[PDB]
Amino acid sequence: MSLYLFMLFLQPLSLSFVSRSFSKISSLMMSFATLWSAVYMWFTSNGANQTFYQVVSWGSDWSTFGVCYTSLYISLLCAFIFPICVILVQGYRALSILICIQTAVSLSIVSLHMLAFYALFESSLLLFFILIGRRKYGSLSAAYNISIYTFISALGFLISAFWLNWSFGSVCALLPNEEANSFVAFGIFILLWVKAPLVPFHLWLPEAHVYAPTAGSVLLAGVLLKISIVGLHVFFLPICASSIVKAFPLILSICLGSFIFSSFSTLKQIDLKKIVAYSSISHMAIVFLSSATNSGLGIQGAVLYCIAHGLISPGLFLLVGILYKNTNTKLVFYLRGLSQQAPVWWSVWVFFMLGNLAFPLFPNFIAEVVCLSALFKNHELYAYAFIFFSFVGTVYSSTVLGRLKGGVSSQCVDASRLDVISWNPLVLATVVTGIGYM
Amino acid sequence: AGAGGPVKLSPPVDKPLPYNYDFWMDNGIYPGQPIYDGMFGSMVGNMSLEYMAKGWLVLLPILSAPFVYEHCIADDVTRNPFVPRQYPSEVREFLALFKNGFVLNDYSQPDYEEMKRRQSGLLTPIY
Amino acid sequence: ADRFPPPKMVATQEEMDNADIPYKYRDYCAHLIIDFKECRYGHPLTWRINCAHELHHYNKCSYIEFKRRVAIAIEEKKRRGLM
Amino acid sequence: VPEPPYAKYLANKSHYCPPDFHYSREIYAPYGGYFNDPKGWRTNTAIATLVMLAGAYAVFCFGNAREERLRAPKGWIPSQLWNDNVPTPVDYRGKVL
Amino acid sequence: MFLLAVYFLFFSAIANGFFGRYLGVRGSQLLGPSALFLALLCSGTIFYEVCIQGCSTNIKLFENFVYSNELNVSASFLYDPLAATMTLTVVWISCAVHAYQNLYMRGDGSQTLFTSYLSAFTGFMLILVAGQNLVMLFIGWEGIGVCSYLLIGYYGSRVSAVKSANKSLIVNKISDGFLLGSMLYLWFYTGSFSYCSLATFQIPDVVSILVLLGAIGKSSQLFFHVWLADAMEGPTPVSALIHAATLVTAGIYVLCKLNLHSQSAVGILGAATALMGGLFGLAANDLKRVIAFSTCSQLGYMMAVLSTCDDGADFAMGHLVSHAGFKATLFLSAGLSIAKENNNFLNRYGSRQGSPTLSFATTIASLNLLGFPELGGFYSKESILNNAYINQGVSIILTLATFLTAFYTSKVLAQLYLFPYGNGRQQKSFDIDATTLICFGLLLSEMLLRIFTGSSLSQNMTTNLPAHIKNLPFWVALSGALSGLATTNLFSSNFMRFFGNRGGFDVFYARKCSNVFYHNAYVSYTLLDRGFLKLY
Amino acid sequence: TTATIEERRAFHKEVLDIVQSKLANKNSEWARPEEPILHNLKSEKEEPHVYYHNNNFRVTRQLIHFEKTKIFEDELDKCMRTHGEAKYRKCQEIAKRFQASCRVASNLERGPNARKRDVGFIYQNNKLRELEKDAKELGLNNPFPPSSPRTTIGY
Ligand SMILES: CCCCCCCCCCCCCCCCCC(=O)OC[C@H](COP(=O)([O-])OCC(O)COP(=O)([O-])OC[C@@H](COC(=O)CCCCCCCCCCCCCCCCC)OC(=O)CCCCCCCCCCCCCCCCC)OC(=O)CCCCCCCCCCCCCCCCC
Ligand SMILES: CCCCCCCCCCCCCCCCCC(=O)O[C@@H](COC(=O)CCCCCCCCCCCCCCC)COP(=O)(O)OCC[N+](C)(C)C
Ligand SMILES: CCCCCCCCCCCCCCCCCC(=O)O[C@@H](COC(=O)CCCCCCCCCCCCCCC)COP(=O)(O)OCC[N+](C)(C)C
Ligand SMILES: CCCCCCCCCCCCCCCCCCCC(=O)O[C@H](COC(=O)CCCCCCCCCCCCCC)COP(=O)(O)OCCN
Numbered sequence A: 001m002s003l004y005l006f007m008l009f010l011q012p013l014s015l016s017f018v019s020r021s022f023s024k025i026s027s028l029m030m031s032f033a034t035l036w037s038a039v040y041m042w043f044t045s046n047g048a049n050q051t052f053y054q055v056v057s058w059g060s061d062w063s064t065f066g067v068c069y070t071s072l073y074i075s076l077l078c079a080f081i082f083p084i085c086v087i088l089v090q091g092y093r094a095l096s097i098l099i100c101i102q103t104a105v106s107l108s109i110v111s112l113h114m115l116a117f118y119a120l121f122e123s124s125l126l127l128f129f130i131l132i133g134r135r136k137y138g139s140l141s142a143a144y145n146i147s148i149y150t151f152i153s154a155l156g157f158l159i160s161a162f163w164l165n166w167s168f169g170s171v172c173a174l175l176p177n178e179e180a181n182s183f184v185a186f187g188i189f190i191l192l193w194v195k196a197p198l199v200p201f202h203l204w205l206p207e208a209h210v211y212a213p214t215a216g217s218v219l220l221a222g223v224l225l226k227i228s229i230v231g232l233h234v235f236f237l238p239i240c241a242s243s244i245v246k247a248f249p250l251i252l253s254i255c256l257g258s259f260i261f262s263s264f265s266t267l268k269q270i271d272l273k274k275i276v277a278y279s280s281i282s283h284m285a286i287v288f289l290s291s292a293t294n295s296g297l298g299i300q301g302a303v304l305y306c307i308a309h310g311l312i313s314p315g316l317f318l319l320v321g322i323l324y325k326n327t328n329t330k331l332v333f334y335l336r337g338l339s340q341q342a343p344v345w346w347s348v349w350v351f352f353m354l355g356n357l358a359f360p361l362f363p364n365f366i367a368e369v370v371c372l373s374a375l376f377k378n379h380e381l382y383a384y385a386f387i388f389f390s391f392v393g394t395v396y397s398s399t400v401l402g403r404l405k406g407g408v409s410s411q412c413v414d415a416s417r418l419d420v421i422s423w424n425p426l427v428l429a430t431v432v433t434g435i436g437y438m
Numbered sequence B: 001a002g003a004g005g006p007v008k009l010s011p012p013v014d015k016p017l018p019y020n021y022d023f024w025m026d027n028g029i030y031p032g033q034p035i036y037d038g039m040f041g042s043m044v045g046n047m048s049l050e051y052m053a054k055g056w057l058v059l060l061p062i063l064s065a066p067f068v069y070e071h072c073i074a075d076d077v078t079r080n081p082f083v084p085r086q087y088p089s090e091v092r093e094f095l096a097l098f099k100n101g102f103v104l105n106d107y108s109q110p111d112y113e114e115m116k117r118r119q120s121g122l123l124t125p126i127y
Numbered sequence C: 001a002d003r004f005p006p007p008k009m010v011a012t013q014e015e016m017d018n019a020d021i022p023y024k025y026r027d028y029c030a031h032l033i034i035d036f037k038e039c040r041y042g043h044p045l046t047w048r049i050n051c052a053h054e055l056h057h058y059n060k061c062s063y064i065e066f067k068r069r070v071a072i073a074i075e076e077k078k079r080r081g082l083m
Numbered sequence D: 001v002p003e004p005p006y007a008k009y010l011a012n013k014s015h016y017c018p019p020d021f022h023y024s025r026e027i028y029a030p031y032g033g034y035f036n037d038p039k040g041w042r043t044n045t046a047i048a049t050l051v052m053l054a055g056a057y058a059v060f061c062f063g064n065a066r067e068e069r070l071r072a073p074k075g076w077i078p079s080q081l082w083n084d085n086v087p088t089p090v091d092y093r094g095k096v097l
Numbered sequence E: 001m002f003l004l005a006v007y008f009l010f011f012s013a014i015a016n017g018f019f020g021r022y023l024g025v026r027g028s029q030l031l032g033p034s035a036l037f038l039a040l041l042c043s044g045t046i047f048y049e050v051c052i053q054g055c056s057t058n059i060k061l062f063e064n065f066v067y068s069n070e071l072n073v074s075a076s077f078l079y080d081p082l083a084a085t086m087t088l089t090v091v092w093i094s095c096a097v098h099a100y101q102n103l104y105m106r107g108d109g110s111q112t113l114f115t116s117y118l119s120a121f122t123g124f125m126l127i128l129v130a131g132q133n134l135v136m137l138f139i140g141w142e143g144i145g146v147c148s149y150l151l152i153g154y155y156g157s158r159v160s161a162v163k164s165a166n167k168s169l170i171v172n173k174i175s176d177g178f179l180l181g182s183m184l185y186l187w188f189y190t191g192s193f194s195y196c197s198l199a200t201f202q203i204p205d206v207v208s209i210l211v212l213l214g215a216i217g218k219s220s221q222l223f224f225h226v227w228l229a230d231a232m233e234g235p236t237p238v239s240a241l242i243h244a245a246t247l248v249t250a251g252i253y254v255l256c257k258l259n260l261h262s263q264s265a266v267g268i269l270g271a272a273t274a275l276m277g278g279l280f281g282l283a284a285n286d287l288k289r290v291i292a293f294s295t296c297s298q299l300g301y302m303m304a305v306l307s308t309c310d311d312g313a314d315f316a317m318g319h320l321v322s323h324a325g326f327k328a329t330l331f332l333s334a335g336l337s338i339a340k341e342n343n344n345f346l347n348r349y350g351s352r353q354g355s356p357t358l359s360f361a362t363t364i365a366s367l368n369l370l371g372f373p374e375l376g377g378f379y380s381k382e383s384i385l386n387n388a389y390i391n392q393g394v395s396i397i398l399t400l401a402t403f404l405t406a407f408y409t410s411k412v413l414a415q416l417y418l419f420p421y422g423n424g425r426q427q428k429s430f431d432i433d434a435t436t437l438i439c440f441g442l443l444l445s446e447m448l449l450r451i452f453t454g455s456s457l458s459q460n461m462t463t464n465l466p467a468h469i470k471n472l473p474f475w476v477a478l479s480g481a482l483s484g485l486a487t488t489n490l491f492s493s494n495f496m497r498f499f500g501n502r503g504g505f506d507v508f509y510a511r512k513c514s515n516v517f518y519h520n521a522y523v524s525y526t527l528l529d530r531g532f533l534k535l536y
Numbered sequence F: 001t002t003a004t005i006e007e008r009r010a011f012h013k014e015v016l017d018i019v020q021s022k023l024a025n026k027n028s029e030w031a032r033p034e035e036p037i038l039h040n041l042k043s044e045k046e047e048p049h050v051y052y053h054n055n056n057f058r059v060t061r062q063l064i065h066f067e068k069t070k071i072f073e074d075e076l077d078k079c080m081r082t083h084g085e086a087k088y089r090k091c092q093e094i095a096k097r098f099q100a101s102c103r104v105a106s107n108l109e110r111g112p113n114a115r116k117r118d119v120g121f122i123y124q125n126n127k128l129r130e131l132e133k134d135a136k137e138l139g140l141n142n143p144f145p146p147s148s149p150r151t152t153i154g155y
């Protein structure tokens, strides 16, 4: 734990002292060192400590950090996926912004103080405004959307944290507190409602992903959406369980509506990135509902599905980025003959799309099975609703694949050595998780 | 020759596109097709949905006539000239348990009423 | 049903289990189905020619049971007054 | 059009390729090209067959260790020659063999 | 020994589809058939050990495949009599199809990838059949679904093939969704996914409906048969595998493995699918389409027989195994005819000098379909028709389907051979190698062995029926065959047109269901997220 | 049942003593307790030490239950595979025990919103028995099936 936190603080620090020409090499080595430190944290985490594997405090309640099941999986996912983002990004400015965003996100996951959690997650607010609104390839609209949505949700969460700190006297997760207040529950909930895109607060995500760089999109879908599940498991369910049980019919309505409307909206998309973004929104609904059931099957299923998404969505966003670099287009209508012209890109694309559809040899299948079982534990109709509407994902994915698969094309647009190197870890991880090493 | 056959290339778009042009599938070969055949444009055989419905209206009664008699008009006693297969008591009691079994229609049995109520079981789990 | 009483069951539970006879086939003809089954499996491809005595005997017993079932049906129908 | 310099490195059209059919020879696919027939195929196939037999041996070992027969076969089964966990056959009547 | 077959097929898939650059076209023409021959030897051993000698075996590969809280499933294979019989049939047909593909696919650029997909397809079918738990069956069900998507759409530059693959994928998604719901119901109230503990004497109707809805997808029954006819876009070897064994049979296999079906529904749905499929096949003018509609009709017969009696499951599986051989033969022969004539239309076929083996194999497969006495198809079909007499409704419809089946089958045989030559005066030829002759030898061997060995234990057991009622299927078949040879008109042009349009199920889906789907998508996106909730 | 503040503070002091006794000797199995800390608190959250210890005990118990269920399933599968066609009569007991284990594991910590897992349809069968008894005694006509002897392989 201490090694992981130290490496996390060293990665932004290293950039200040690098030669400005060695920046990319140093950043890659630091990312790998952070991954190795995360593996060490996993090694030093004994299952015998059932509640929290490790807790460290550095002199205050704010500096209380600790790892649990959700935290451990998300932290390992962030450390696994960061090297890919690093190699995909060029320039000191871009590296600095990305490394600061990563440090803030990775510190947020392990934080056990609500106020510290807020301080670390929302520090990366201007950096995303600047990243999504970059000079030539960025959109100011998307930056404004994401920034305003984040500020409003996090401010509500902050108000709830202030009330809990005033009333109980502490806001640390390790101190058992329960609250029946509905205003405070709503304040904590609104952050989760926005961060994990749920209809009608999902509009910020697609704009940000489309106008973000591939490293940014990969980080966003891979781990930024997951930060909601850490807040739910660590900062919402322990204190506001009563309000989740009181509002379960409403929670279920909003989650199922998000899943349905997002699936239908994905059908009208002509941009590959927008298709992947709306697929993520649809997938987040099952995770949110499963965790809200407050059952063992649901919490485990939600975390597992989150890992599966955090392994499948970065792959699709990476392949889309590679294709866009080769062709300078994201319109499905312009891209044809990709099967014949890019047999190697096509194979990986088909594999990842099969993963997104929750086929058996993919992590998504196991995760979905567990989440559906949790819903069936609640009610049979709850499970049936989700299972039936899954066909809509098939229709859009099939239509996209069919449009891309065949036609006439005069351009050989296949992946280079660098592109295969970038996806190989993701492919291997997907396969390993698919075979049951979740 | 299966491979290398000539094909006609679809002309490049030269006019403003309709908003719902995503309903058309064009790979670059000349004969493009709707996303679902028959949704619009030429219909196979020049047969509308109304024609198909009128056909099904003519056909449905003739097809349903055999099934309606036995299922509704006929009764267990009159459906067949024999009783269901007779089994020893130990075998019969176990076989009667199966809701989808064939021994539940034995009117001769003194447990007919219970077996008939078992066959018409619960629509959904009570718990 | 009472007028036409069931025949005696030659096959015991132990024999039917030992011959792996499903429950559905335990219908007063199980001994003959055991004979036929053992012969059919003993001759995998030549059973149609070789194993004909056992099939004949089973079919005869089945015929007698079918006649009993029809008799029971007629008796029940007469009791209810339909015929 | 004057073929590019790299075209010397690329392979020719195979015997099975129809003469009219034109394909780009630069494209790489893991499953192979349009008509394949590479030189050295006979050796590659022999290596493949050897890897197949070795994997079959490993699979056979694994299966034999994990094949659990809990009910006696009606008659002699081929598995007895190679696997020692087969219960002694009992016939339909019940007699042990 | 039991694992070996699956290993051989998956190896042949990985080798041809990942190492085809090294192996070559010839290397796939060796490794494919060699692996399939080895798998046939293993499947034969399995069949002898399990079916003939009653020795079921369970092989647990690993435990805790899914281990979340109470929910626990393991990757285990139980070879029961149903599994052994299906394994044998599947591997025999796949070995024949692999031998067939050596010459048929020589004119196709990716012969290595085709062989790889065929072997992976066979492997997933063996996983589905041999699974010991519902999760393993789902793994096989999805694997065959994906392999069908990758094989029907093999010709990507044809919009019809890609649409046919999308259609298959969507229909199979709806079906596997109903299956997943049923498996969740069964796990929740029985505690396990294993078929041994899955047994429930009384099941709520919901589970029965969900199981049936799941099964009707792969086994194309009414309302879910749209994809089968379209699946003709794919190459002929794919059609033989899907129709004869891999896809259509899975639904029946699921229904027979877990007897949760309801008698009232299965009988009506089956008899309806039999009649409709026969009527659709009457109108059809493509050789490959007629054999698909024939497959639909036969599936209707198998589904219908489950309702009639307790032995219906045995009768259905017996028909399934008998049907796979002759139907595979019909598809392979149709493909060879198409290849030799460069034509897909029945009008342009005619008498022409050919190979004796192919013409005989076509005649014998057609006779098995027709119901010619003392043939494997005859015994498996009479077992169904004779036992269906008790259900008056099912019997009448099934006899009418027998008539229509005979009529189209006889018409097709007359058109392909007896009729004078109908194609143009142009040079066309397809020379058959010894590999094709071996493939037809294998199919004929299966057909012959089926007569000697039989399909069900209760096949020749007496059905206590009057002689006139027992021999009626034969008279109806003969009458249909005679009417088909005369090429007489049976229906008015209005009905012939209706049957050519396949009942207009797809026209209904396009005009109403697809329009509603895209209007829901328009309201969800254009009107709302990008309309009401989008800033100027 | 009322808890006075004096009693609450007394229990708090006792809990602190229990913590001090646990702290005196190192234990690698501290978070896998074999016995719960008994209490009469209205809310377990009041005493944090009791809450965490009891939660760890509950997790330990649930893990044990899950493994027991897996063992029961293994004996049921072996029994089913050994008997053959006599499985229905001979494996009724093992199946009954396995289903009981499944219910105990699932029901103990189902959650606030989860329904009881009716493995074996015992609750449905009981409800149908009560409905039948009431209809028969009151002279009503029952629109539901009568209770079944066996509804599953075991229960
Ligand atoms: C003892 C033994 C020695 C061992 C060493 C140990 C010592 C420990 C620490 C010592 C390390 C040196 C500290 C660095 C100081 C200068 C850093 C800097 O200027 O940044 C850019 C600078 C790059 O310089 P440059 O490329 O040459 O061009 C800059 C030009 O001057 C102007 O260029 P421009 O005009 O084009 O501007 C473009 C701008 C685009 O415009 C923007 O985006 C503006 C956005 C506003 C701020 C960003 C808001 C979000 C920032 C979040 C904080 C990041 C960490 C996240 C972790 C969460 C923490 C809660 O983009 C950027 O500038 C970079 C984007 C990301 C960097 C933002 C992070 C810097 C925050 C504040 C810097 C400190 C200044 C203090 C001033 C002191 C006296 C003046 O340095 C970097 O390499 C990246 C930043 C490194 C961050 C570490 C600094 C700590 C801040 C974290 C706060 C935690 C509290 C502090 C405690 C720290 C430990 C005790
Ligand atoms: C660009 C790629 C080119 C190279 C291609 C690579 C080819 C890959 C070959 C495919 C692998 C197929 C093997 C599947 C089995 C997975 C192996 C495995 O997981 O090892 C098991 C051991 O089990 C085995 O070895 C299985 C035997 C493999 C071979 C046996 C027959 C081969 C036929 C394939 C059919 C497998 C069906 C399984 C479906 C789930 C680990 O044992 P445990 O200690 O119990 O692990 C815990 C379980 N869990 C993973 C869930 C955490
Ligand atoms: C279960 C135990 C063992 C598991 C083995 C599974 C069998 C082999 C699995 C190999 C990897 C699985 C997925 C491979 C990547 C997916 C892409 C693919 O399969 O095909 C690629 C390309 O194929 C490859 O290069 C790799 C394939 C090698 C082996 C594939 C065997 C079939 C795949 C099995 C299905 C996966 C199961 C997933 C769900 C159960 C695209 O092909 P097409 O879209 O048809 O276009 C090709 C061009 N043409 C138009 C001419 C057809
Ligand atoms: C007691 C009080 C009684 C109630 C009184 C309420 C009175 C008003 C309350 C509204 C407070 C919401 C604050 C957001 C205002 C909407 C955004 C401003 C619109 C806008 O044009 O912003 C542009 C881009 O913003 C964007 O692109 C953002 C798009 C819209 C943001 C969506 C808002 C976040 C989600 C809303 C609610 C979520 C949960 C609520 C609990 C930038 O404009 P410019 O820089 O060019 O300036 C040039 C001047 N025109």
Ligand SMILES: CCCCCCCCCCCCCCCCCCCC(=O)O[C@H](COC(=O)CCCCCCCCCCCCCC)COP(=O)(O)OCCN
Pocket: A156, A159, A160, A163, A182, A183, A184, A185, A186, A187, A188, A189, A243, A244, A247, A250, A251, A254
């Ligand atoms: C119309 C559908 C509702 C949309 C929400 C759908 C799903 C949201 C569920 C979130 C789960 C936990 C949140 C707890 C309650 C929030 C909404 C529950 C529904 C609700 O409004 O109930 C009200 C009580 O809640 C309250 O009194 C508080 C309402 C929320 C306050 C709104 C903004 C608060 C922001 C405060 C920021 C932080 C403050 C911290 C000090 C009135 O119901 P009732 O019981 O009176 O029944 C009388 C009817 N006959």
Ligand SMILES: CCCCCCCCCCCCCCCCCCCC(=O)O[C@H](COC(=O)CCCCCCCCCCCCCC)COP(=O)(O)OCCN
Pocket: B048, B049, B050, B052, B053, B054, B056, B057, B060, B063, E222, E272, E503, E504, E505, E508, E511
């Ligand atoms: C053996 C088992 C049964 C298998 C299939 C049985 C199907 C029987 C259902 C058809 C019989 C009743 C039809 C309703 C009566 C309508 C009579 C005339 C129809 C009519 O005037 O309008 C049509 C409405 O479509 C319609 O008629 C659609 C109504 C159909 C109800 C949904 C049932 C599923 C149908 C699936 C196959 C049926 C294919 C043909 C219906 C065409 O409307 P339009 O497009 O011209 O309007 C213009 C666009 N503004």
